[PDB]
């Protein structure tokens, strides 16, 4: 009788807060499969489930590495109810630093998890939704998928890629009754903002002094933007529930309107000149 939800990337942040928001819903409408790359990281998902008092049987954890199509197929197999009514593609990696300072493996990894991983989910789960003629897909997006940010070149590349992927799919899926939406997040208060950049010694080793200095300047500024604009994952989760509930969902939901001016400026000078000038000024 329940809405079956499968979420990727639940060990922390938005995926964690969404899974237990859904599982602990006063109305008990949702059966949640919360998936994680590594089950050793599953504790917080249980600390928090106990805190919001999720009913027994509301929340099931599954191991699911989105780099591995056999792992995607094994997690699907484990969906006893034999359908997924809501698929949430949220697993993601960050990467921050001078481009020439990033390892080639890390670059490939970010693309594999953020982009190919989402493809793998969609390949494995869309066919059955198209046949039932129903289903909702919610993809965690970013404002860095809508505008480019210095030192986030690869991260932005992976989030722009998701815009292209999802927008392309949406044009097709429209008459199938399968709804795909991006939830476009600005800065969110989670953990992310030191885990994903090397040591100062490492970075200086791999770039010039002037680039290093501009990286410090970007970081300082980034910290201020987070301090003034970062939303909690509670607020973010609730936008996913809005999309999930809309009878006619749009391709994009924004968790904040704050960056929509910047976006408009981007969008009305397609030479990119005004955007690049404005953002250079703003960051540096």
Ligand X SMILES: C[C@]12CC[C@@H]3c4ccc(O)cc4CC[C@H]3[C@@H]1C[C@H](Cc1cccc(C(N)=O)c1)[C@@H]2O
Which residues have a catalytic role annotated? 155
240 binds its own copies (CB under 8 A): no
Nearest distance, CB of residue 155 and ligand NAP, angstroms: 9
Segment (H or E) for 16: helix 13-23
Residue 137 main-chain phi, psi, to 5 deg: -120, 125
148 binds ligand NAP (CB under 6 A): no
Q: Write out the binding residues for its own copies, residues 89-148 only, by CB under 8 A.
A: 99-100, 102, 104, 107-108, 111-112, 115-116, 119-120, 122-123, 126-127, 130-131, 144-145, 147-148
Choose between 49 and 207: whose C-beta lies nearer to ligand NAP: 49
| 32 appears as a binding residue in the annotation | yes
Nearest distance, CB of residue 203 and ligand X, angstroms: 14
CA distances from 119 to 126, 139, 160, 225 (A): 10, 11, 14, 31
188 binds ligand NAP (CB under 6 A): yes
- DSSP labels, 179-238: EEEEEEE--BSSS-TTTTS--HHHHHHHS-HHHHHHHHHHHHHHHHHHHHHPBPHHHHHH
Size of interface with ligand NAP, in residues (CB under 6 A): 29
Q: Which of 252, 253, 255, 246 is nearest to 86 (CA)?
A: 246
Among 149, 192, 229, 241, indicate the residue that binds ligand NAP (CB under 6 A).
192
Q: Write out the binding residues for ligand X, residues 170-189 only, by CB under 6 A.
A: 186-187
Question: Would you state the structure tokens that stand for residue 210, as one six-digit string?
Answer: 């002037």
Q: Which of 161, 75, 160 is nearest to 125 (CA)?
A: 75
196 binds its own copies (CB under 8 A): no
Nearest distance, CB of residue 268 and ligand NAP, angstroms: 23
Q: Write out the binding residues for ligand NAP, residues 254-273 only, by CB under 6 A.
A: none
Choose between 116 and 225: whose C-beta lies nearer to ligand X: 225
| 222 appears as a binding residue in the annotation | no
- DSSP labels, 133-171: T-EEEEEEEEGGGTS--TT-HHHHHHHHHHHHHHHHHHH
Q: Write out the binding residues for ligand X, residues 14-73 only, by CB under 6 A.
A: none
| 159 appears as a binding residue in the annotation | yes
Q: Which of 130, 138, 147 is nearest to 267 (CA)?
A: 147
Size of interface with ligand X, in residues (CB under 6 A): 19
Q: Which of 4, 114, 135, 14 is nearest to 62 (CA)?
A: 4
Question: Would you state the structure tokens that stand for residue 55, as one six-digit string?
Answer: 């009913």
Among 107, 149, 161, 263, indicate the residue that binds ligand X (CB under 6 A).
149
Angle at the Cα of 79 (from 74 to 85), degrees rounded to 5? 120
Annotated binding-site residues for NADP(+) read 9-37, 65, 159
The residue ranges that bind ligand NAP (CB under 6 A) are 8-16, 36-38, 41, 64-67, 90-93, 113, 140, 142, 185, 187-188, 190, 192
């Amino acid at each position: 009788a329940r809405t079956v939800v499968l979420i990727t990337g639940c060990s922390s942040g938005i995926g964690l807060h969404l899974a237990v928001r859904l599982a602990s819903d006063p109305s008990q409408s949702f059966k949640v499969y919360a998936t994680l790359r590594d089950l050793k990281t599953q504790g917080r998902l249980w600390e928090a489930a106990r805190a919001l008092a999720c009913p027994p049987g509301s929340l099931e954890t599954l191991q699911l590495d989105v780099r591995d199509s056999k792992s995607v197929a094994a997690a699907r197999e484990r969906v006893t109810e034999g359908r997924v009514d809501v698929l949430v593609c949220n697993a993601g990696l960050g990467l921050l630093g001078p481009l020439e300072a990033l390892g080639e493996d890390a670059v490939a990894s970010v693309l594999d998890v953020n982009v190919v991983g989402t493809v793998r989910m969609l390949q494995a789960f869309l066919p059955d939704m198209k046949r039932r003629g129903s289903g909702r897909v919610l993809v965690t997006g970013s404002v860095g998928g809508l505008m480019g940010l210095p030192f986030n070149d690869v991260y932005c590349a992976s989030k722009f890629a998701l815009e292209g992927l999802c927008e392309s799919l949406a044009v097709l899926l429209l008459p199938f009754g399968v709804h795909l939406s991006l939830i476009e997040c600005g800065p969110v208060h989670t953990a992310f903002m030191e885990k994903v950049l090397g040591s100062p010694e490492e970075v200086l080793d791999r770039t010039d002094i002037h680039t290093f200095h501009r990286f410090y300047q970007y970081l300082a500024h980034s910290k201020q933007v987070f301090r003034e604009a970062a939303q909690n994952p509670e607020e973010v989760a609730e936008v996913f529930l809005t999309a999930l509930r809309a009878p006619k969902p749009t391709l994009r939901y924004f968790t904040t309107e704050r960056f929509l001016p910047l976006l408009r400026m981007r969008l009305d000078d397609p030479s990119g000149s005004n955007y690049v000038t404005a953002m250079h000024r703003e960051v540096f």
